[PDB]
Design an enzyme around this catalytic site. Structure first.
Site, PDB file in Angstrom:
ATOM      1  N   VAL A 267      45.023  32.048  43.956  1.00  0.00           N
ATOM      2  CA  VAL A 267      45.241  32.855  45.148  1.00  0.00           C
ATOM      3  C   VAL A 267      45.760  31.975  46.283  1.00  0.00           C
ATOM      4  O   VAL A 267      46.765  32.291  46.930  1.00  0.00           O
ATOM      5  CB  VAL A 267      43.944  33.580  45.538  1.00  0.00           C
TER       6      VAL A 267
ATOM      7  N   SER B 118      38.613  22.037  40.778  1.00  0.00           N
ATOM      8  CA  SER B 118      39.345  21.458  41.898  1.00  0.00           C
ATOM      9  C   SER B 118      39.847  20.052  41.589  1.00  0.00           C
ATOM     10  O   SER B 118      40.942  19.679  42.030  1.00  0.00           O
ATOM     11  CB  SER B 118      38.464  21.445  43.149  1.00  0.00           C
TER      12      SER B 118
ATOM     13  N   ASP C 256      29.329  28.682  54.440  1.00  0.00           N
ATOM     14  CA  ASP C 256      29.029  27.340  53.954  1.00  0.00           C
ATOM     15  C   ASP C 256      30.205  26.388  54.164  1.00  0.00           C
ATOM     16  O   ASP C 256      30.001  25.215  54.493  1.00  0.00           O
ATOM     17  CB  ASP C 256      28.642  27.394  52.472  1.00  0.00           C
TER      18      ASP C 256
ATOM     19  N   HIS D 125      31.349  48.241  41.352  1.00  0.00           N
ATOM     20  CA  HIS D 125      30.806  47.085  40.642  1.00  0.00           C
ATOM     21  C   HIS D 125      29.281  47.073  40.574  1.00  0.00           C
ATOM     22  O   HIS D 125      28.745  46.786  39.486  1.00  0.00           O
ATOM     23  CB  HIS D 125      31.337  45.792  41.274  1.00  0.00           C
TER      24      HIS D 125
END
Lengths: 427, 427
Positions: free
Chosen positions: A11, A39, A97, A214
């Site tokens: 994204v 990552s 965070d 969901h």
């Protein structure tokens, strides 16, 4: 003019290419390559090739292209300097965070924060947090990401593929018709993506079907068993019992959650969601013979039991893709045979809970906490969370010999909840 | 003591074996070997071997055995002499046509007439007709045939196989608790077939699920197209649109017909049919999670829309056999992939309409005619028949170069209707 892109997944890569081609910002990106093998691989790949790439399939989209950025940070803590625009391309439960890890200097420079995949109440959390550093911060929320972007080869994660593009997206800002909103609108025009501008980010945040469906689909005993324990035989997210969870009981649970959300939305004077019309006209269509047009339009007027019947019928109509090309035997494409992702071990051998329902626990918890603050009862929401929490506790007791992620922990999201508390007190 | 068995198909053969083993009647049988290649083959086979045979699969049934009869007639017209008992083992729409072909001597001797596969109102037709010859004729109606009996080899049609046996049958007589009823009850006991004795044949005739569900399933534009014209791709009787006819529209049409029938039944002071309970407890079961036990029990109290939702859900639950053994991929047996029989040519090159819906046209026509005589409106029944009639007229105009059966004719069943008219006038 500098932009910070938080996230290094597909994204973020698609969005950075759009900023690269259609904006004048210098672009830095930041992942968590210090702590995630994912990552790390992206950082290693970018470091080597020194470029990202977006490709498209169905043409007539200007999303493609090879690009480079100014600086890829390895870790949020390493971020330095001023950025007027920050794009949150991570999961909504990481907004607080990650921001809280930026420096004071960085936070005081931010004028606009753009939330790509927020949940209901993300903007409230993000605005209340930033208000401590900026005086007039602009926060923008989209209803969802613009489409589907994937990594086709895990060893080239800097190369991503955007396969599908949504019919319609919604966007709202704390700064109505801002210059930033106007440039996004003009940008959507260029990309041939219909974008409806909405009067608040919260309103945009409610135009997400997965918000309402969901939790019923994944936070029940059948689905939670499939995810935390497994099944003797594969079961499927979208099939009818016993092949899957869908029953009259599930569908009632779905209407009850929708109505509890429609209660909260009314408090904020946010228009309600015609859930069935949303499913049928914006997600996937059904044949004309399946549903009456007058019932889809008037869905919100209709008696409760008829609302449930229409929802049940909607789900049975997409057991197949009724627009697909049939077999020579009359058999259509098995559109509903979507497996549940189960719990799984890290590269560090740590058990994780998949995105569904771990993301739905956060989203549902935030709606719970919002509902609590307005004095609005959410008995169905309440049971969704106790179910999820009982499966986490059960996994802990049954797997004491296993390293488990923080997702199994009690009393999560305290920072997030305090911030919406404070936001709603003030507002 | 002589018995005449009308019919030479597998049903008649199974019944003749029961009469052979467990009764003291001399048994004659009669088909239409003069005019049907089917009956001809049976006659030739019996003539050659001089025996019939019933076999069974699932044991613990005393239906099996090889037997012979006294006389196989070739044609109803050939029947001679006295018969105290006649068993109608043909289709219900032939009851009048075949009886009216017997001799006066034969008709005056008949004391009991047993209707194996009647429709609603068969007894009324048969009793009113016989009343002209006997003074106190006994007429017995069963709800359905006792199971499934087939010919496994078309060139040995005197050998038949009974595969399944129904859980429950109903039986009523014009002569309550007659000696004949009592011997049938004792006989059912021997065969381990549950038989509930009911106070009237008409009441037994309404305990047939196919009465309420076949007309909605076959007399709509989708099914009637599949049968009279065909489809580009196979479609299936019991699947959801577009794979099959089942929709909210079909299900509404099904509840409307059930309620119109429940109107007629109330006139005759016949208890109503809990249609869903009937489907779920006597035909095929569903998993407990699929339907609420309280909803099945109280089906007749429930609001119309909830009645339709439960019926729809029932049909979706048996798209598969949820009690079958799943695939290693979670895939169950495709219980619902039943093709439509289409129109087809004879051995004489004559177009026939298959039993479904040709039998359902007769049954529905008789209910229509009954409803008309009581001053009870049947708007849904009415539309079922006009649809069938419009497909027959359309086939005629589109196939002028083809020989067509009497099933395509206008104003059928005049004899049958006059007899129920006269019966209801008198009663």
């Amino acid at each position: 003019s500098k932009l910070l892109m938080i996230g290094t997944g597909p994204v973020a890569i698609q969005l950075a290419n759009i900023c690269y081609l259609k904006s004048d910002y210098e672009i830095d990106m930041v992942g968590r390559a210090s702590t995630s093998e994912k990552s790390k691989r992206l950082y290693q790949a970018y470091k080597k090739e020194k470029q990202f790439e977006v490709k498209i399939q169905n043409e007539a989209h200007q999303h493609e292209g090879k690009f480079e950025i100014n600086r890829l940070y390895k870790d949020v803590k390493n971020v330095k300097g001023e950025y007027e625009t920050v794009v949150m391309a991570c999961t909504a439960d990481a907004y607080y965070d990650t921001l809280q890890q930026l420096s004071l200097e960085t936070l005081q420079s931010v004028k606009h924060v753009i939330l790509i995949s927020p949940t209901f109440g993300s903007q409230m959390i993000v605005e209340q947090f930033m208000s401590k550093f900026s005086q007039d911060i602009e926060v923008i929320s989209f209803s969802t990401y613009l489409g589907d972007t994937r990594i086709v080869d895990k060893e080239a994660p800097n190369h991503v593929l955007t396969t599908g593009v949504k019919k319609k997206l919604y966007m709202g800002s704390t700064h109505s018709n801002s210059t930033m909103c106007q440039r996004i609108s003009a940008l959507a025009e260029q990309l041939k993506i219909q974008l409806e501008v909405v009067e608040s980010p919260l309103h945009a945040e409610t135009r997400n079907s997965s918000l309402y469906v969901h939790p019923p689909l994944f936070m029940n005993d059948f689905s939670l068993k499939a995810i935390f324990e497994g099944t003797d035989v594969p079961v499927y997210v979208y099939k009818l019992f016993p092949e899957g969870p869908i029953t009259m009981t599930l569908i009632r649970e779905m209407r009850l959650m929708w109505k509890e959300m429609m209660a909260i939305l009314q408090a904020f004077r946010v228009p309600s969601v015609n859930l069935l019309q949303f499913m049928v006209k914006e997600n996937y269509p059904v044949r004309p013979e399946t549903l009456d047009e007058g019932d889809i339009e008037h869905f919100e007027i209709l008696p409760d039991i008829l609302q449930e019947y229409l929802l049940y019928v909607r789900y049975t109509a997409i057991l197949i893709d009724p627009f697909s090309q049939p077999d020579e035997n009359g058999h259509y494409f098995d559109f509903s045979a979507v497996p549940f992702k189960q719990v799984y071990k890290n590269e560090q051998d740590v058990v994780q809970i998949p995105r569904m329902p771990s993301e739905d626990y956060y989203r549902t918890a935030m709606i719970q906490h919002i509902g609590k603050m307005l004095g609005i009862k959410t008995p169905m929401i309440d049971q969704f969370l106790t179910r999820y929490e009982a499966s986490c506790q059960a996994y802990k007791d049954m797997h004491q010999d296993q390293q488990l992620s923080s997702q199994f922990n009690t009393n999560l999201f305290e920072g997030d909840k305090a911030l919406v508390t404070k936001f709603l007190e003030i507002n």
